[PDB]
Structure formats: C-alpha cells, structure tokens
C-alpha cells in the first residue's frame, strides 16, 4: 500500500495473508468470507506470463495478522488449503478479466477478536454503494512504494472513479468485471495498492446496516500511485453467482 497508514488492531479481521511455504515469503492478500472459505485474486495463484502456477500444497493461509513478518503467537491462525478454485473464464492472457479465485480450508478457522469474516454484497448494496466518489478501503502488506516493505498491515481509503475516467487512464481493455479507484491528480490526496497487495479486499461500510462489505479485489494497476493512473479491482458482485455456485457445490 502506497501513501496509506498503519492499520489499527482488529481493523480488518477478514484480512488474510497468502504465504509461500518455500521460500517463505508473502504472496498476496486475501479475505475471509466464512470459517472455511477464503477469497483472493486468480492471478495470485495462476499467472503464466510470470511462470506462476501454485498448487494447494505450495501455500499457507495466515489469518488474524497485523505484523507482516512476525509469527504472531496466540493471535494469528495458520490454515492449510484443501482446494483452489479459479474462475473458469479468468483471462490471464489479456487483461485479467474475472480475476477471482476461492480457496477452501482443510479445517474451519476459529473466529476471535482478530479473525472475522467480511460480508459479500447483494445486488442492492452493490447498486447503492458502487458509485463514483464513494470511498472504499484497501488493506495489505504490499510494497510502500512502486520502486520498502511495511512492519504492519497498511490501510488506505480511496474513492471509486467514473468509468470513462478509468477507461481513459489506460490502454488496457476494461470490462464490467472491473472497477477502478484512486484520487485524481487535481484532488491532491494520494494512495494506491501495490505489488503484494493483490488478492486483498476493497471494502465499504454500508451506511444502511453498518456492516462491512467486500466490493472489490486488488487486481492490477500501471505502476503504483502514479498521477493519472488508478488501481483496478475485481468487481465482486458481478462474479457472485460464480462464488455461490462453487460454495454450494463444494462447501
């Protein structure tokens, strides 16, 4: 996260760290959506241009974390993966269309002060909140600058951007399964996700029922926090039918 700040304790109890077993390193962010299901970006698991194709046994999920590198004894919980599910129409060849994947845990994780699932949006909440100017929140342990690394989880609030502005900011083909967020050059304020934040959640707090909903997944961006560029996020509601299909079939 670039130009964000340290998270408060328990601020984002759905935040998950995707952790590579060997070598031990941060792979991606992710989010807890039930006691056995974790949501992330497909490109965290599968991205052939970078020779990335992880299997279940390659990875661990670390939940309840604050510190990036510490083993947070008596606080974090570490889960093994039973199965990865990548969207069948995930487009890694072109523009990361449908950049979404689910991971089923081998055992349920116990909820605590530090570990708690985020809601997924239904149609009405999505329609109400996914509006240009409305701000969401992005969290992660990714890089602090495009070109070091944070001691603890970082947070930044960013406004959703009008779709024509998103489109005009890039040569990449944008789809309805994406939205973009961030400040404009004229707006002064800054901030963006970056490398290592991928798969993490873009959340919004509904003013109707005061619950946090995950509207987006950190997906892609040209550099990090560049003037005139924006962060792009997987549109979670647009892909919720796939999410529900997988959980209904395999959960």
């Amino acid at each position: 996260i670039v130009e964000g700040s340290d998270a408060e304790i328990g601020m984002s109890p759905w935040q998950v760290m995707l952790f590579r077993k060997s070598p031990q390193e941060l792979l991606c962010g992710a989010s807890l959506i039930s006691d056995r299901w974790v949501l992330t970006a497909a490109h965290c698991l599968l991205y052939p241009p970078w020779d990335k194709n992880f299997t279940e046994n390659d990875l661990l999920v670390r939940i309840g974390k604050h510190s990036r590198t510490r083993y947070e004894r008596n606080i974090e919980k570490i889960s093994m993966l039973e199965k990865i599910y990548i969207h069948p129409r995930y487009n890694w060849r072109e523009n990361l269309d449908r950049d979404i994947a689910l991971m089923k845990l081998k055992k349920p994780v116990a909820f605590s002060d530090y570990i708690h699932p985020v809601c997924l949006p239904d149609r009405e909440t999505a329609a109400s909140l996914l509006q240009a100017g409305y701000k969401g929140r992005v969290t992660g342990w990714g890089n602090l600058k495009e070109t070091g690394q944070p001691s603890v989880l970082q947070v930044v609030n960013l406004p959703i951007v009008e779709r024509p502005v998103c489109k005009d900011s890039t040569r990449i083909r944008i789809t309805d399964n994406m939205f973009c967020a961030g400040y404009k050059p004229d707006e002064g304020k800054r901030g963006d996700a970056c490398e290592g934040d991928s798969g993490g959640p873009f959340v919004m707090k509904s003013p109707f029922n005061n619950r946090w909903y995950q509207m987006g997944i950190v997906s892609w961006g040209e550099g990090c926090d560049r003037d005139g560029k924006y962060g792009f996020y997987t549109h979670v509601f647009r892909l919720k039918k796939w999410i529900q299909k997988v959980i209904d079939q395999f959960g």
Binding site: K21, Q24, L26, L60, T69, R70, Y71, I78, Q149
Partner: peptide
C-alpha cells in the same frame, strides 16, 4: 525476512 513458523504447519 520472515520469522519461522511452527513446524506443525509445514508437515
């Protein structure tokens, strides 16, 4: 750069 995690999670 990361603290070692308990062996039980690597088995």
């Amino acid at each position: 750069d990361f603290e070692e995690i308990p062996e039980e999670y690597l088995q």
